């Protein structure tokens, strides 16, 4: 059965391959720090989005594989939408408020490392600024976004989901009525607000398309982008059916 001569020959054998640090000369120190810091913050925000989703009335009664699925389809949409909002409220003019301690100005987002992406994240920020969305409006909207993408083969709790979704759509109406009145029916603000939601599909699809067109750019990458590659695991349909308020 097999064999090798000396004990050193064996210590030689089990000696492990060399590990790389994943350190590329080309990426500047500042680009690495910012993109590293976001990635780990992103990770933490996903954890928090799930915890949150698990607190959401209705949704939390949906079968767990539905919670999973919905979470998997919508986490980017959610997070991007909250970044829009954080930014909208920490602004006046055109920042991305990734965090309180990590706010990126307009000049930073100009650079080639930032530009393609921040176009799409600002788009959400500036639209919230355009429609002067209230917190109540946003809270309802953000929930609607969780329930915005469904698999074509059905959820396991479809009737619950449907009525859940309706409720939160009615809750959005109540949000607009809190801000407007109800001497009106608020049909245009409902069209405008829903339409922003509809567009988050695009801001997400553009963000994911960026991640694929940047993942491919890493030929030979000594520092392999599993962060930008894992983002392609949990997002890659096709089952995903986008629910649109306006076709």
């Amino acid at each position: 059965h097999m064999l090798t001569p000396t004990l050193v020959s064996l210590l030689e054998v089990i000696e492990p391959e060399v590990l790389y640090a994943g350190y590329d000369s080309s990426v500047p120190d500042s680009t690495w720090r910012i993109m590293t810091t976001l990635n780990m913050l992103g990770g933490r925000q996903v954890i928090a989005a799930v915890k949150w989703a698990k607190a959401i009335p209705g949704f939390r009664n949906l079968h767990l594989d539905d919670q999973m699925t919905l979470l998997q389809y919508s986490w980017m949409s959610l997070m991007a939408f909250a970044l829009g909002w954080r930014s909208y409220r920490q602004s006046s003019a055109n920042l991305l408020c990734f965090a309180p301690d990590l706010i990126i100005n307009e000049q930073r987002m100009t650079l080639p490392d930032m530009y393609d992406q921040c176009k799409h994240m600002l788009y959400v920020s500036s639209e919230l600024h355009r429609l002067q969305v209230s917190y109540e409006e946003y809270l309802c909207m953000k929930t609607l976004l969780l329930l915005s993408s469904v698999p074509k083969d059905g959820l396991k709790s479809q009737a619950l989901f449907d009525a859940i979704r309706m409720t939160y759509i009615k809750e959005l109406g109540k949000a607009i009525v809190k801000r407007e009145g109800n001497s009106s029916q608020n049909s245009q603000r409902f069209y405008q607000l829903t339409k922003l939601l509809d567009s988050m599909h695009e801001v997400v699809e553009n963000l994911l398309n960026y991640c694929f067109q940047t993942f491919l750019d890493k030929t030979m990458s000594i520092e392999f982008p599993e962060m930008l590659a894992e983002i392609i695991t949990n997002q890659i349909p096709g089952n995903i059916k986008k629910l649109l308020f306006h076709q």
């Binding site: 996903v46 799930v50 999973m68 998997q72 894992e230 983002i231």
Partner: peptide, 15 residues
Amino acid sequence: NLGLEDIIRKALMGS
């Protein structure tokens, strides 16, 4: 050490 869908799964239950 943990895929995205792994993080979501872990969060849905217990990290």
